[PDB]
Write a protein that binds this ligand. Structure first.
Ligand SMILES: Nc1ncnc2c1ncn2[C@@H]1O[C@H](COP(=O)(O)OP(=O)(O)NP(=O)(O)O)[C@@H](O)[C@H]1O
Ligand SMILES: Nc1ncnc2c1ncn2[C@@H]1O[C@H](COP(=O)(O)OP(=O)(O)O)[C@@H](O)[C@H]1O
Ligand SMILES: [Mg+2]
Ligand SMILES: [Mg+2]
Ligand SMILES: [Mg+2]
Lengths: 139, 7, 747, 372
């Protein structure tokens, strides 16, 4: 990251500081990393966080200078399509099945997150054009 | 028998 | 390998036979496995086995145990248990066999709506139900003029009676005309009176096979039924071990003795008579014989035994009890006599209406008739007591046959019978602390049935294989014929027992010696218990059982002197007594030889007929509704032989799939160019990729077979891919969720 | 399925039947008749020779031969006629289909066993057969593994001690006294009272007199003094023509010759003192158990009082403190057959048979090693 990049990143980090001490919580680290264009799994996030225990993950605060190596480490299409074609082969995907798998397998999300990302992309049959939705979530 | 007796 | 981080396995436990462990860290090839439990364990892998794997959870709970990829004791037990406890389904296809766990409770699953749902269906499509067996028999009888049989097996209390009851009710519903089913049911309390006994493990253990034949007219209206019986235990009439009773009827009769009619019999209490006395336990908890007497006589009356005959029956039974009390004084080594004005014999002669002097004479002498010349000669007290007891046994077995004939007269219907379906209730395999001639016979019968079952399953699977055009040889046949030849064949255990009965100064010591000399290392299935010269071990299909010699020469001996029968035939007091005999080679036969011959007539009946099997299990001893115990059931599955059936099908090709449904399942694995619109050749390719050995799977014309491992691979690999795919999508979606959170940051 | 034939050749009676049944279903004398007179009438059914109950019926015109004398078969063509008659006429069963069990006395010549096997395989084609010692079979019949058998038929008498199912071959005794040579003496003493039975047909009448009226005296000198001193003992019997004959001391005096063979001019001691000498030839541990069982077998032991005379003088010879017991079941005439009927039915015996294969391979020689 260059100085300009470091300045933009610092500004973004400070926006996530909800206490005014110039720090975020460990549990926000993943959110900030994803907001900067990385798409790490919770496993990758916990790995760069050092697999913290519940107490420090929920209340220990780190400033930008400590976050930055973690952002760096995290930073350092055809598979996405085949992954969606798993759940297809007429180019559609049930809304119910995507909702179930995202809320029940892997790193399960909340129903509100899934409704939010899925809002407006499924038709009356309950089918999702997954190439367009993928372009949407990659934009 | 054959000697010491008739049968 | 199949063993990985967060695999699952079963490990043995003494308080429930098997318990589930996760594999805490992967195995690499020896001494130890690291295990995690519902807490944490490290476990010696020991000379040698790995612990059994656990099936992938989609398979668990599906109707047919053969569907499970891993076939082994704890997966079977688990599937039965989760179906029984969680689903509360009681019926399960093991292969062809229906397994029916006794629920100890009434259920709504029986009724005409269900019956109409089962009518016309194949076995496979609907969930297993006893009606789904009755329907198979019904339609196969429609397809083919061949009669059908249903075979119901297990320790009594497992509910073989109720399982027959429902099959009959199904026949009565699906086609109609007429009363016969209720008339069949009403026979049971007399059959259970004469033919059931308390045994150390059990009450109302039936000691005989019972075969009900249901006949049909050409339009398959029920005509009526006739009842046969086989394999009646006789030695129980005169001998009991500790904590056994004699057949119930003797005790019901003794407890009646205060009633008005029986006053003439001079019946005592049941500890008085030598044939009731030996067991130790006149009374049973919660079964009270004085009330049971009413049920017995009522069932006689519904089956229309005249109240003239009903008294005759109790006359004969009292005759037998009184007979056993007759006692002899020896007055030489070679001779004996009955002490004068002996009271038991006087009462016996009164009851049987015979000359006391002729009974008293014939009990102690036997008559040997050459062509011209006849000699009446004395006999040892030992022989006099053997003769008396063979007479008691011969009376009882004839009385039993006569009662069964009168019940047939009640059930029979004159309209000619086009074909029949027959239902066999027969005891299962038996093992106790002590094993004796009764167990030896019961286990021999079960081996012969288990052979016939192995034959039928092998035939069916062979014909399905060539229907699918696969080579036959791939199905081995597992054959217990060498054990049957151990027991029955010449110079067998039975043949040497029948020899040692006639041999001079035969004894169980000399009999055991003859066994060892004949078989001890000439055979693999026969072994001597290390510490004893008195016992021997036969390896049966289900288990090794150790038999004590010490009873068998007492129990195997029947011989009846014709003089003593002719005396009884002369009795003019009443008609039933000469009626029993009405009818010299047979009178020589030993009890083992009579049993071996009764079993041939049974097998000759069943081989006529195409079987469908039921097995019954008794999941907990204390009749707690809908409870299951691992430690009881693991025994009973061995006794009923479900476990050999399974392990013999665990070798082989236990699993089978349509190309359609396999492909539908596993499009997930398949690269879109590698998918053709043809299912068959695409999948024939894919399986060659996914599993090395064609040895593990065969392409049948319409179905894919696999060996027991192979479906586990498919579900494991499927889950591996589907997990990865989810994680990869999921994180990137969280990328956009953080975009929306930056939009939050602007708000 | 297939059940052995059991046949006892004996002398006098043949007795035969199927194994595993209670008593022989064919019994008849082993006697061959040939007619000796000129035949007058024509178109008669007149016949070369007759066997068994036929020859008894016609005996007035026949010469009767016994083909077995002192347990040795003397004539072979006669014996084949007797066997042929047994299987086809008495039992009516083809000998191809049934193993056969045949019985013999001990210490008789080996050629007897050889030729008796050769005839059974070659002419009858009996599929398997066996030859057994008469005395052994009496123990099977009487339910014992131990005893000394005293056996006397017509012809040979013999003793065989057996202990726990082992024979003791050096102690076996054989004596030619019994049964025929009693009758041949009874004819001579009856001549003293003025009756003459010479012909072979008359011998059968004397044999019937012996079977009916003779008995053994407890004390021989007391009863001779008594029957000298009274007519109380004296009985009369009716010949086949209706004459009547009266017999006194001769009736006890005949079977006494079993106990004093010097009457007929033999050397040996009587049956009590060969029984005792036989027990004396055994080792001293067993003797107490042989004295406790003496099994009498065969028809010449049927006379009334023969058991009580035996018990009395063996108790005189024996050491004073041992019980002597004589076992004499009323069956005993058939004991050898009943014993063989038991033996031929045992499962353990089905490996013992000489089978035709072994004979065809090894010839008549085999019998001596495989049997006894
Ligand atoms: N399919 C079933 N549905 C309902 N109850 C059942 C079923 N199978 C067994 N039972 C119960 O099992 C209990 C005992 O079975 P039952 O057939 O009466 O044993 P039984 O009288 O000893 N006959 P048996 O075991 O052959 O000697 C009864 O209370 C039944 O209700
Ligand atoms: N009741 C009897 N009393 C005395 N002697 C008899 C009696 N019955 C048969 N005998 C004689 O015994 C001999 C037959 O004995 P048996 O056992 O038949 O001989 P074998 O064993 O050779 O056939 C003949 O002398 C016969 O006359
Ligand atoms: Mg029952
Ligand atoms: Mg019941
Ligand atoms: Mg003889």
């Amino acid at each position: 990251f260059n100085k300009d990049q470091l300045e933009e990143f610092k500004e973004a980090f400070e926006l996530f500081d909800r206490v005014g001490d110039g720090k975020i919580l460990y549990s926000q680290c993943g959110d900030v990393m994803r907001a900067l264009g990385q798409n790490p799994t919770n496993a990758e996030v916990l790995k760069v966080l050092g697999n913290p225990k519940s107490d420090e993950l929920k209340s220990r605060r780190v400033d930008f200078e400590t976050f930055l190596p973690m952002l760096q480490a995290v930073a350092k299409y055809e598979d996405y399509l085949e992954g969606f074609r798993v759940f297809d082969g007429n180019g559609k995907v049930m809304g119910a099945e995507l909702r179930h798998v995202l809320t029940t397998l892997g790193e399960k999300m909340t129903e509100e997150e899934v409704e939010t990302v899925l809002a407006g992309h499924e038709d009356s049959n309950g089918c999702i054009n997954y190439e367009a939705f993928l372009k949407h979530i990659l934009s | 028998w054959x000697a010491x007796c008739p049968a | 390998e199949l063993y990985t981080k967060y695999a699952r396995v079963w490990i043995p436990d003494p308080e429930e036979v098997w318990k589930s462990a996760e594999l805490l860290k992967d195995y690499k090839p020896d001494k130890v496995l690291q295990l995690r439990l519902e807490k944490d364990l490290e476990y010696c892998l020991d000379p040698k086995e790995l612990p059994p794997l656990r099936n992938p959870d989609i398979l668990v709970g599906e109707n047919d145990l053969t569907a499970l990829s891993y076939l082994h004791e704890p997966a079977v037990l688990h599937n039965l248990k989760v179906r029984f406890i969680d689903s509360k389904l009681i019926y399960t296809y093991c292969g062809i066999v229906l397994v029916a766990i006794n629920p100890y409770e009434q259920l709504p699953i029986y009724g005409e709506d269900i019956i109409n749902a089962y009518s016309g269906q194949n076995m496979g499509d609907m969930d297993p139900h006893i009606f789904a067996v009755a329907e198979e028999a019904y339609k196969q009888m429609a397809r083919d003029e061949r009669n059908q049989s249903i075979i119901v097996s297990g320790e009594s209390g497992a509910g073989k009676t109720v399982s027959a009851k429902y099959a009959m009710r199904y026949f009565a519903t699906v086609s109609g005309s007429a009363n016969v089913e209720e008339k069949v049911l009403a026979s049971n309390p007399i059959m259970e009176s004469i033919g059931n006994a308390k045994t150390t493990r059990n009450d109302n253990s039936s000691r005989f096979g019972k075969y009900i034949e249901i006949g049909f007219d050409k339009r398959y209206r029920i005509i009526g039924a006739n009842m046969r019986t086989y394999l009646l235990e006789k030695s129980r009439v005169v001998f009991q071990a500790e904590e056994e009773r004699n057949y119930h009827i003797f005790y019901q009769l003794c407890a009646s003795a205060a009633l008005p009619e029986f006053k003439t019999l001079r019946l005592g209490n049941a500890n008085y008579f030598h044939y009731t006395k030996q067991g130790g336990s006149p009374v049973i908890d919660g079964i009270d014989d004085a009330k049971e007497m009413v049920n017995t006589r009522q069932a006689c009356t519904l089956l229309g035994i005249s109240d003239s005959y009903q008294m005759g029956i109790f006359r004969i039974l009292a005759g037998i009890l009184h007979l056993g009390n007759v006692e002899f004084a020896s007055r030489d080594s070679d001779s004996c006599a009955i002490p004068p004005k002996h009271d038991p014999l006087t009462i016996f002669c009164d009851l049987m209406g015979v000359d006391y002097e002729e009974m008293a004479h014939w009990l102690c002498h036997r008559k040997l008739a050459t062509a011209t010349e006849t000699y009446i000669k004395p006999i040892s007290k030992l022989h006099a007591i053997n003769a008396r007891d063979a007479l008691a046994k011969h009376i009882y077995a004839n009385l039993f046959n006569w009662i069964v004939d009168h019940v047939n007269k009640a059930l029979h219907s004159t309209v000619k019978q086009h074909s029949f379906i027959g239902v066999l209730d027969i005891y299962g395999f038996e093992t106790f602390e002590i094993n004796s001639f009764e167990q030896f016979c019961i286990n021999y019968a079960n081996e012969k049935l288990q052979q016939q079952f192995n034959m039928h399953v092998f035939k069916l699977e062979q014909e399905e294989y060539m229907k699918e055009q696969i080579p036959w040889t791939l199905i081995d046949f597992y054959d217990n014929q060498p054990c049957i030849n151990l027991i029955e064949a010449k110079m067998g255990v039975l043949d040497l027992l029948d020899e040692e009965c006639k041999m001079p100064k035969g004894s169980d010591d000399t009999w055991a010696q003859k066994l060892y000399n004949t078989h001890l290392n000439k055979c693999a299935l026969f072994e001597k218990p290390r510490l004893s010269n008195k016992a021997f071990i036969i390896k049966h299909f289900a288990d090794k059982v150790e038999y004590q010699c010490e009873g068998f020469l007492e129990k195997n001996k029947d011989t009846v002197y014709e003089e003593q029968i002719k005396v009884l035939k002369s009795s003019k007091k009443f008609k039933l007594l000469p009626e029993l005999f009405q009818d010299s080679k047979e009178h020589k036969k030993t009890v083992g030889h009579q049993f071996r011959n009764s079993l041939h007539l049974l097998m000759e009946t069943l081989n006529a007929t195409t079987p469908h099997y039921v097995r019954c299990i008794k999941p907990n001893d204390f009749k707690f509704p809908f409870t299951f115990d691992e430690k009881r059931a693991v025994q009973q599955l061995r006794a009923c032989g479900v476990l050999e059936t399974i392990r013999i099908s665990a070798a082989g090709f236990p699993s089978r799939w349509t190309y359609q449904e396999f492909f539908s399942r596993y499009r997930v694995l398949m690269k879109q160019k590698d998918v053709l619109s043809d299912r068959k050749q695409t999948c024939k390719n894919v399986l060659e990729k996914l599993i090395l050995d064609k040895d593990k799977y065969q392409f049948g014309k319409t179905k894919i077979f696999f060996r027991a491992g192979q479906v586990a691979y498919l579900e494991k690999i499927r889950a591996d891919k589907l997990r990865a795919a989810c994680i990869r999508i999921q994180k990137t979606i969280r990328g956009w969720l953080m975009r929306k959170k930056y939009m939050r940051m602007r708000r | 399925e297939t059940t052995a034939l059991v046949c006892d050749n004996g002398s006098g009676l043949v007795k035969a039947g199927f194994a595993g049944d209670d008593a022989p279903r064919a019994v008849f004398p082993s006697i061959v008749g040939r007619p000796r007179h000129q035949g007058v009438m024509v178109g008669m059914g007149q016949k070369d020779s007759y066997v068994g109950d036929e020859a008894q019926s016609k005996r007035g015109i026949l010469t009767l031969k016994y083909p077995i004398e002192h347990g040795i078969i003397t004539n072979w063509d006669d014996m084949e006629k007797i066997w042929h008659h047994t299987f086809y006429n008495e039992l009516r069963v083809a000998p191809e289909e049934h193993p056969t069990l045949l019985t013999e006395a001990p210490l008789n010549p080996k050629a007897n066993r050889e030729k008796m096997t050769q005839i059974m395989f070659e002419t009858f084609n009996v599929p398997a057969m066996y030859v057994a010692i008469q005395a052994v079979l009496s123990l099977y019949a009487s339910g014992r593994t131990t005893g000394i058998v005293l056996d006397s038929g017509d012809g040979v008498t013999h003793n065989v001690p057996i202990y726990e199912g082992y024979a003791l071959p050096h102690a076996i005794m054989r004596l030619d006294l019994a049964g025929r040579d009693l009758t041949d003496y009874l004819m001579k003493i009856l001549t003293e009272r003025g009756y003459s039975f010479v012909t072979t047909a008359e011998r059968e009448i004397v044999r019937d007199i012996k079977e009916k009226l003779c008995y053994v005296a407890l004390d021989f000198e007391n009863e001779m003094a008594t029957a000298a001193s009274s007519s109380s003992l004296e009985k009369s019997y009716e010949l086949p023509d209706g004459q009547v004959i009266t017999i006194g001391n001769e009736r006890f005096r005949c079977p006494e010759t079993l106990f004093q063979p010097s009457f007929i001019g033999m050397e040996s001691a009587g049956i009590h003192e060969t029984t005792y000498n036989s027990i004396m030839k055994c080792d001293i541990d067993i003797r107490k158990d042989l004295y406790a069982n003496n099994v009498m077998s065969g028809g010449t032991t049927m006379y009334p009082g023969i058991a009580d005379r035996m018990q009395k003088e063996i108790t005189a010879l024996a050491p004073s403190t041992m019980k002597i017991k004589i076992i004499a079941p009323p069956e005993r005439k058939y004991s050898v057959w009943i014993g063989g009927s038991i033996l031929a039915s045992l499962s353990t015996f089905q490996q013992m048979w000489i089978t035709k294969q072994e004979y065809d391979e090894a010839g008549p020689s085999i019998v001596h090693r495989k049997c006894f």
